Design an enzyme around this catalytic site. Structure first.
Site, PDB file in Angstrom:
ATOM      1  N   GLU A  50     -14.356 -18.554 -46.295  1.00  0.00           N
ATOM      2  CA  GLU A  50     -15.714 -18.354 -47.015  1.00  0.00           C
ATOM      3  C   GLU A  50     -16.001 -18.879 -48.631  1.00  0.00           C
ATOM      4  OE1 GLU A  50     -15.308 -13.942 -46.276  1.00  0.00           O
ATOM      5  OE2 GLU A  50     -17.544 -14.250 -45.523  1.00  0.00           O
ATOM      6  N   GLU A  95     -19.799 -11.061 -35.323  1.00  0.00           N
ATOM      7  CA  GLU A  95     -19.130  -9.917 -36.041  1.00  0.00           C
ATOM      8  C   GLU A  95     -19.659  -8.695 -35.395  1.00  0.00           C
ATOM      9  OE1 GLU A  95     -18.571  -9.934 -40.229  1.00  0.00           O
ATOM     10  OE2 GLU A  95     -17.759  -7.669 -40.372  1.00  0.00           O
ATOM     11  N   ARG A 145     -20.996  -6.768 -51.782  1.00  0.00           N
ATOM     12  CA  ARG A 145     -20.153  -8.128 -52.402  1.00  0.00           C
ATOM     13  C   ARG A 145     -21.462  -8.776 -53.166  1.00  0.00           C
ATOM     14  NH1 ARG A 145     -15.831 -11.072 -51.117  1.00  0.00           N
ATOM     15  NH2 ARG A 145     -15.211  -9.366 -49.477  1.00  0.00           N
TER      16      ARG A 145
HETATM   17  O1  LIG Z   1     -16.084  -8.118 -47.348  1.00  0.00           O
HETATM   18  C1  LIG Z   1     -16.415  -8.763 -46.061  1.00  0.00           C
HETATM   19  N1  LIG Z   1     -16.462  -7.740 -45.161  1.00  0.00           N
HETATM   20  C2  LIG Z   1     -17.091  -8.147 -43.906  1.00  0.00           C
HETATM   21  O2  LIG Z   1     -17.299  -7.257 -42.853  1.00  0.00           O
HETATM   22  C3  LIG Z   1     -17.161  -9.575 -43.983  1.00  0.00           C
HETATM   23  N2  LIG Z   1     -17.632 -10.447 -42.747  1.00  0.00           N
HETATM   24  C4  LIG Z   1     -17.887 -11.716 -43.495  1.00  0.00           C
HETATM   25  O3  LIG Z   1     -18.161 -12.620 -42.628  1.00  0.00           O
HETATM   26  N3  LIG Z   1     -17.319 -11.762 -44.351  1.00  0.00           N
HETATM   27  C5  LIG Z   1     -17.154 -10.410 -44.875  1.00  0.00           C
HETATM   28  N4  LIG Z   1     -16.872 -10.055 -46.134  1.00  0.00           N
END
Ligand SMILES: O=c1[nH]c(=O)c2[nH]c(=O)[nH]c2[nH]1
Ligand SMILES: Cc1cc2nc3c(=O)[nH]c(=O)nc-3n(C[C@H](O)[C@H](O)[C@H](O)COP(=O)(O)OP(=O)(O)OC[C@H]3O[C@@H](n4cnc5c(N)ncnc54)[C@H](O)[C@@H]3O)c2cc1C
Ligand SMILES: O=c1[nH]c(=O)c2[nH]c(=O)[nH]c2[nH]1
Ligand code: FES
Ligand code: FES
Ligand SMILES: [Ca+2]
Ligand SMILES: [Ca+2]
Lengths: 1299, 49, 98, 49
Positions: free
Chosen positions: A1235, A776, A854
């Site tokens: 996820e 990412e 989170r």
């Molecule tokens: O709330 C999230 N933001 C992200 O940038 C992200 N990246 C990820 O793999 N899961 C999440 N969840």
């Protein structure tokens, strides 16, 4: 002689200048362009490079076939063999049955492991056209997959086995195997099996290899040049060379010599030539074991038991018995067995021959044997056991299959005839010293003793004093290792009582208490049983509308055939260069100087890039606090200092070794506690609080406080990070092909480093072999370096990271430490909760604060808590920067919740499922952050799971097992989850698409999402086909690119089908609105007529689409506004059986019920549920990274980092998608799935915790009730928590520190 | 015409789904794509010029 | 582009239409996967046809940015664009002319 | 176009043209071509997919 001649896919290869350092993997990919065979690790553990070898065996006289790891097979070992790769068995025009079945059964997600698994299954079929289910699973002990959770692979291939809601696939449509249609064995090789083999010599850049044809030649060479290094299977030497930088400039391979390959049956045993592969030892010993009396095969059975868990088929096909002995590793599984049984070794040199019994003197020192330098090992005789002689072998590792022993042992006793009196006792261990050792101070004392309880106590006391380990012992786990030596002896002690009983001496030694019997059983699993339940689409839905149907991943056939192209599979330009990163070997230090004088001498060296070469800005990273290349100081082991550019990857690696950095150390902050002590954090404390804590705790009947530590996680995408950057020579234009989830940030970061506008930089992603959050952001640290190189040289430049580099540089999931306090009523109702979370963020901010947000949004898991306070702080440390990993803080937050919840139930004395149920939210409730729970399906998932799993009846069976077994225990738990869907940063919830309809009617679609195995392009083609009302066959997606859809969010947050699915829908609706006048004139005339009529009426057939998720935006200041668009829900019940003596466990059964709304594609969704669950199984029970006290990652490849294996998954694995639960606010009423399932694997962690509690009830002496179980609950943690008579006997410089 | 650069095409097969990218000195990308796709018998969406 | 300066003319047209300098706009290439079903560059007509397409794509972007330009009538182009991105407004558009 | 660097595995093509204004093709002999080092294939109407 001289030419190296072998065959690949039936074509002759003649290599006139073979280099001994060239592997078959590099030769296939780079010389022959056959890129279906992949690099996943280069150290033999992952199988991605598997291929088949065929040859004419002159010793057995027949054509034989076996699999090898191409990454470790020297081409110089392969003269006159025939290699078959994935391209050699079929392609998409004519798939082999093995390729067809894995693709159609949804056994290929990212696809990067597919060719290796195809070649393992193919080679099994070439040897055994009707295999058993067991043989099929065994074929893959050497193959890893990170995406599928293994289930669909084994289920699709069960259709080959002798003994093998709508359906996810139809085996009735698989084509039959016709073995006569396999590729011919090359006719030249048969002609050549006539002519005698002659000695060959190959000369490389640095190494000479001699392939010796006769014993005479070998011994003459070794007498003239005793330095000549023997290489047989290369499974150890290849690792010495590639990873320890050992260079042996003269190698001799004696694999052809008949004397080193013979098997002779003598009066005392069976003699194996030293070069016999372990696969031949297994087939030989298995035949003998099946036809000889049990009394003669005790030692053969101990060897077989160790070979069960020795790597997989690829390694055992080429690894030799002599090579294991001479390697003399402290962790050899075989040397403790050969030492305990006194195996006879014959040693020869030119003019000499001698025979020694293996004993303690054979191994005099670290990696040494008693061989003279001119001597070689000729043969080992494995002995028959005698009357009254019993043997056991044991291994305990971090994972049962394909792992390195933590402790391994051979144990032998011989009794005086007709007595239970000891004549001989030998107990030998690996993993407890720098060599295989005998417990020589303990065993003599037992001679003449009767086999009884006093002998057990004497031996245990002796071992506990004799087998000491220093606090700093390499590998740590000193309490666990010592406890295993005694626990293994106990098993042997009980086994021997049983064997004495079978010899009719039960009156002398006593019967074994039946509650102890299960302690001595050899490992065995029930055969698998799996269920997948999902919802059929409506009967009236058109057959051309694939939304909600189980359509296989669109690239699965090409993945199975090796034709799907990943970044490093793209052909190099003729002028392309290679880049190698040079990284810091200090956690925190000034760079005093850099010396590149050795690097400059490497052939093909181009330049060494450093901070000085950055054209514009060296500041990079999501929060602009990272260097492109370190300036003045390094801030972690793995901090990139610069990059070598050379012609080839080998020259770049060799030049990187000649970059010499001088440092001056600065105070390092490594651990969360170091950070707390130094006030070193990223930003301020984050907090969510609701209600009145003082009041809730005063009202609580009971208060429980504790802490929990959760280790981090490496993504282990099977394709590592890779970028090719192609400079265009004009206007700073550059195009980059990258394995990344984030094309927008890659483009932005490259453009800033170069100082050019974003409009000059294009980033293209066709697919990734996995990403999981690790690509990412962290992919950019490769992309920016490769882009600078291409800009400086004006030449395309490529870098794919080796696994060790990728694991060290790119970081992982965040370790969490949490301190909690929970208030609750005697009824189990929770009334107050305060949790302080800390995470270890490493050396840049990256996504760490959002990860902590989170974790705090999920600190409730499924539970309504009226008075609640959660804080989090992110530690800034001198470690590699941690980043997104599937779950993104959710799994850590929810594990802490379930952990105190487990303690609530135990403290109240109430059934855990009742306590969780009565604390669950209800529909319409507000969370701790004030979001209303609408469409709350969690109670349905819970009732369906508890009913369908028969959880109550199973509780009764677990209690009965625990009352009837002392040394094995079962545990059972059911765990819910709620997971908020949408990026926590509101504006990232946006997606774009672009669609074209060409004049032939065919549709080219692209969107911002990237394919990493999750089947996102498949879903988008399903959506576009429904939206346009045309078959999916008319629509294609080729790639993701910044110059077709700009400003895209990363493919992350489980949100990419929701966001891009809406963008796709809107672009299609725009096309349909323009075609509407033409559909009105020709309501029946086909789609192609409408399209051509629009075109020749000059109507545009291209459109963009765009979506943003509405109504999002939470404030931490006011605790208001919605962070999430909706929530995912699901429940899993899991059962385990732990071995209380070793810490191993079986995952007996898991049942999952998951709310995916109206699934867009149930095959892909079930695949996501199973793949996410198995990654969480690894997080909570198997995967651990160890670091030195100086902050250096020790764990850098699959040899040490143990992800789930084919044999790790629940034996009964049932997955159901909730029925009748449309989610109308996301595309076609679906829900995100990537996820949310992962945390459900905590059901295994809590089943384990239930089992440990039952073991502590059995053997603990007033043990602590709320005992600590940190994550992951590995065999070490499980075994140490099972306190008993053995642990009690086995109770600041160290090998690792807790970070 | 005596354009100083004569006609020139590089065609790069991608190995997947009939996909191919062509770098061409042409005034007519659309007919180049159409004609290549008809000769191969693949849809126009597989061919990029 | 075949030497006639079409891309130069389309950059001149986009810069007028968007009211930003030519330095901020780039054309890299022509490709069937960014604009489909195109007529040949022929008949002297390609700046007429593509210049109207370009003008229309730019009018669509300006319509999207107009609320940001209203909130910030002088703040530079870079600010209106970043405000539009962080409000989740699309910054891509097709244009077409017959 | 021809300034673009070649891939390491890139091949080169040359067209074979008629030397007659209007004729039947009675036969085609490629023996001599097949002896040239580096020859890969001669494509004709029969190879069109
Ligand atoms: O709330 C999230 N933001 C992200 O940038 C992200 N990246 C990820 O793999 N899961 C999440 N969840
Ligand atoms: C993925 C993987 C998993 C593994 N799993 C295990 C495991 O579970 N347990 C375990 O015990 N090992 C394991 N190993 C280690 C390795 O496979 C064994 O030690 C193997 O038996 C080495 O044999 P080889 O033929 O490949 O040795 P090579 O690498 O070819 O040689 C090893 C050493 O032996 C010498 N040698 C070989 N033959 C002779 C001879 N006749 N006389 C004198 N010297 C000789 C060589 O000079 C060299 O020093 C694993 C290795 C890999 C790559
Ligand atoms: O009317 C025209 N049509 C064309 O296709 C063409 N091509 C060209 O060069 N000039 C013209 N003029
Ligand atoms: S690349 Fe060969 S086993 Fe992993
Ligand atoms: S499909 Fe197996 S590693 Fe991705
Ligand atoms: Ca990583
Ligand atoms: Ca970080």
């Amino acid at each position: 002689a001289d030419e190296l001649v072998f065959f690949v896919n039936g074509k002759k290869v003649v290599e006139k200048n073979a280099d001994p350092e060239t592997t078959l993997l590099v030769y296939l990919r780079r010389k022959l362009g056959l890129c279906g065979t992949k690099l996943g690790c280069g150290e033999g553990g992952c199988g991605a490079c598997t291929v088949m070898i065929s040859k004419y065996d002159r010793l057995q006289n027949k054509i034989v076939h076996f699999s090898v790891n191409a990454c470790l097979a020297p081409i110089c070992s392969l003269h006159h063999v025939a290699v078959t790769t994935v391209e050699g068995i079929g392609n998409t025009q004519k798939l082999h049955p093995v390729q067809e079945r894995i693709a159609r059964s949804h056994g290929s997600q990212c696809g990067f492991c597919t060719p290796g698994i195809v070649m393992s299954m193919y080679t099994l079929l070439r040897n055994q056209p009707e295999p058993t289910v067991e043989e099929i699973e065994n074929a893959f002990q050497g193959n890893l997959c990170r995406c599928t959770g293994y289930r669909p692979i084994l289920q699709g291939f069960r259709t080959f086995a002798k003994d093998g809601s709508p359906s996810l696939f139809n085996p009735e449509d698989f084509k039959p195997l016709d073995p006569t249609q396999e590729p011919i064995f090359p006719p030249e090789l048969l002609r050549l099996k006539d002519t005698p083999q002659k000695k060959l010599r190959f000369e490389g850049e640095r190494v000479t290899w001699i392939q010796a044809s006769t014993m005479e030649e070998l011994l003459d060479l070794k007498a003239q040049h005793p330095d000549a290094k023997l290489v047989v299977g290369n499974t150890e030497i290849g690792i010495e060379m590639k990873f320890k930088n050992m260079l042996f400039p003269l190698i001799v391979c004696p694999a052809w010599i008949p004397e080193l390959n013979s098997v002779v049956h003598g009066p005392e045993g069976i003699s194996f030539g030293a070069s016999c592969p372990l696969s031949l030892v297994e087939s030989v010993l298995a035949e003998e074991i099946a036809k000889l009396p049990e009394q003669k095969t005790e030692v053969f059975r101990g060897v077989m038991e160790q070979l069960r868990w020795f790597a997989g088929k690829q390694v055992k096909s080429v690894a030799s018995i002599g090579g294991n002995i001479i390697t003399a590793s402290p962790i050899s599984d075989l040397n403790p067995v050969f030492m305990a049984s006194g195996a006879k070794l014959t040693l020869v040199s030119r003019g000499t021959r001698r025979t020694v019994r293996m004993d303690h003197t054979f191994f005099p020192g670290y990696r040494k044997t008693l061989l003279r330098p001119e001597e070689i090992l000729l043969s080992i005789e494995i002995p028959y056991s005698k009357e009254g002689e019993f043997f056991s072998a044991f291994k305990q590792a971090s994972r049962r299959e394909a792992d390195i022993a933590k402790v391994t042992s051979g144990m032998r006793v011989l009794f005086k005839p007709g007595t239970i009196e000891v004549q001989e006792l030998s107990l030998c261990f690996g993993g407890m010293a720098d060599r295989t050792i005998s417990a020589l101070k303990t065993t003599p004392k037992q001679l003449s003793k009767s086999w009884n309880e006093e002998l057990l106590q004497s031996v245990c006391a002796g071992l506990a004093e004799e087998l000491q380990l220093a606090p700093d012992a390499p590998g740590g786990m000193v309490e666990f290792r010592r406890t295993l030596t005694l626990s293994f002896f106990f098993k042997f002690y009980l086994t021997v009582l049983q064997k004495l009983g079978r010899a009719d001496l039960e009156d002398m030694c006593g019967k074994l208490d039946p509650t102890f019997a299960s302690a001595t059983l050899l490992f065995q699993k029930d055969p698998p049983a799996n269920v997948q339940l999902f919802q059929e689409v409506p009967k009236d839905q058109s057959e051309e509308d694939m939304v909600g149907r189980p359509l296989p991943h669109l690239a699965a056939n090409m993945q199975a055939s090796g034709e799907a192209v990943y970044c490093d599979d793209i052909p190099r330009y003729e002028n392309e260069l290679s880049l190698r990163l040079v990284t810091s070997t200090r956690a925190h230090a000034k760079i005093t100087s850099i010396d590149t004088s050795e690097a400059k001498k490497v052939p093909g060296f181009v330049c060494f890039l450093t901070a000085e070469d950055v054209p514009n800005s060296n500041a990079t990273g999501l929060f602009n606090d990272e260097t492109v290349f370190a300036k003045d100081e390094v801030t972690c082991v793995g901090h990139i200092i610069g990059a070598v550019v050379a012609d080839t990857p080998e020259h770049a690696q060799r030049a990187a070794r000649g970059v010499k950095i001088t440092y001056e150390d600065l105070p390092a902050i490594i651990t969360i506690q170091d950070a707390i002590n130094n006030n070193s954090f990223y930003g301020s404390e984050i907090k969510i609080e609701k209600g009145d804590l003082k009041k809730g705790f005063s009202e609580a009947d009971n208060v429980v406080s504790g802490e929990l530590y959760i280790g981090g996680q490496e993504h282990f995408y099977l394709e590592t990070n890779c970028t090719i950057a192609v400079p265009k020579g004009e206007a700073g234009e550059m195009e980059l092909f990258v394995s990344t989830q984030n094309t927008m940030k890659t483009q932005s970061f490259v453009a800033k480093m170069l100082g050019v506008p974003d409009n000059r930089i294009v980033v293209r992603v066709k697919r990734m072999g996995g990403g999981f959050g690790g690509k990412e952001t962290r992919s950019t640290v490769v992309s920016t370096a490769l882009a600078l190189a291409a800009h400086k040289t004006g030449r395309p430049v490529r870098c794919m990271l080796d696994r060790d580099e990728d694991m060290l540089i790119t970081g992982g999931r965040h370790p969490f430490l949490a301190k909690y306090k929970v208030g609750f009523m005697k009824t189990g109702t929770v009334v107050a909760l305060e949790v302080a979370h800390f995470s270890n963020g490493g050396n840049t901010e990256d996504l760490s604060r959002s990860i902590m947000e989170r974790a705090l949004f999920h600190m409730d898991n499924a539970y309504k808590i009226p008075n609640i306070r959660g804080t989090g702080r992110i530690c800034k440390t001198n470690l590699p920067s941690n980043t997104a990993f599937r779950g993104f803080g959710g799994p850590q937050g929810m594990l802490i919740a379930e952990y105190w919840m487990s303690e609530v139930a135990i403290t109240c004395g109430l059934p855990a499922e009742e306590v969780r149920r009565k604390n669950m939210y209800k529909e319409g409730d507000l969370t701790h952050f004030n979001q209303k729970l609408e469409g709350f399906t969690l109670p349905r998932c819970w009732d369906e799971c508890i009913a369908s799993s028969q959880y109550l009846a199973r509780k009764r069976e677990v209690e009965k097992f625990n009352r009837e077994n002392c040394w094995k225990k079962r545990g059972l738990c059911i765990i819910p989850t709620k997971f908020g869907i949408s990026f926590t940063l509101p504006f990232l919830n946006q997606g774009g698409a672009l669609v074209h309809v060409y004049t032939d009617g065919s549709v080219l679609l692209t969107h911002g999402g990237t394919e990493m195995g999750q089947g996102l392009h498949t879903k988008m083609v399903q959506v576009a086909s429904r939206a346009l009302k045309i078959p999916t066959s008319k629509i294609h997606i080729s790639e993701t690119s910044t110059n077709t859809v700009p400003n895209t969010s990363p493919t992350a947050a489980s949100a990419s089908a929701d966001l891009n699915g809406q963008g796709v829908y809107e672009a299609c609706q725009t096309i349909l609105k323009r075609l509407e006048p033409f559909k009105k004139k020709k309501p029946t005339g086909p789609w192609e007529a409408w399209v051509m009529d629009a075109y020749t009426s000059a109507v545009s057939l291209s459109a963009t689409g765009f979506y943003k998720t509405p109504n999002l935006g939470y404030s931490f200041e006011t605790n208001s506004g919605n962070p999430f668009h909706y929530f995912s829900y699901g429940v899993a019940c899991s059962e385990v059986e732990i071995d209380c003596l070793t810490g191993d466990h079986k995952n007996l059964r898991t049942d999952i019920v998951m709310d995916v709304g109206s699934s867009l594609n149930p095959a892909i969704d079930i695949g996501q549920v199973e793949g996410a669950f198995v990654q969480g199984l690894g997080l909570f029970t198997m995967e651990e990274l160890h670091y030195s006290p100086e902050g250096s990652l020790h764990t850098r490849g699959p040899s040490t980092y143990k992800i789930p294996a084919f044999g790790s998954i629940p034996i009964e694995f049932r997955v159901s998608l909730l029925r009748d639960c449309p989610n109308k606010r996301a595309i076609y009423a679906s829900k995100a799935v990537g996820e949310p399932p992962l945390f459900l694997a905590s059901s295994i962690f809590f089943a384990i915790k239930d089992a440990i509690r039952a073991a502590r009830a059995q053997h603990g002496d007033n043990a602590k009730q709320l005992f600590q179980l940190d994550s992951p609950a590995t065999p070490e943690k499980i075994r140490n928590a099972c306190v008993d008579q053995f642990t009690t006997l086995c109770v600041c410089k160290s090998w690792s520190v807790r970070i």
